[PDB]
Design a protein around this nucleic acid. Sequence first.
RNA 1: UGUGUG
Length: 115
Amino acid sequence: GSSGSSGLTQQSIGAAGSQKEGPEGANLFIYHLPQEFGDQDLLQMFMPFGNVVSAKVFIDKQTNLSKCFGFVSYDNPVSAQAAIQSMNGFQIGMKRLKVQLKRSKNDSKSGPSSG
RNA sequence: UGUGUG
């Protein structure tokens, strides 16, 4: 299987059901999603902005429902930035999506607080 | 029910 053409606005479904975190500036955090939204829905939503390595809606392991937040990993930071610029404020159902770069460790702090 | 778990 393959994406059928290099001129297409879409790609192969090699990114849904995964969890791989994208490189620096290429990983996204999405918030205010529907509770029935899946990993393939978030992929097909973000497909137009570049090539996606991994796409995931955070699903509750107890009930199989979405927690209204998700993630998208591009192969480069310009496609991720273009998706922030296109999807931050996107109206869906009856509410607007919030979109930005993902949170991650990039800092350190002191051990003892008393001396 | 604010940051890729199952």
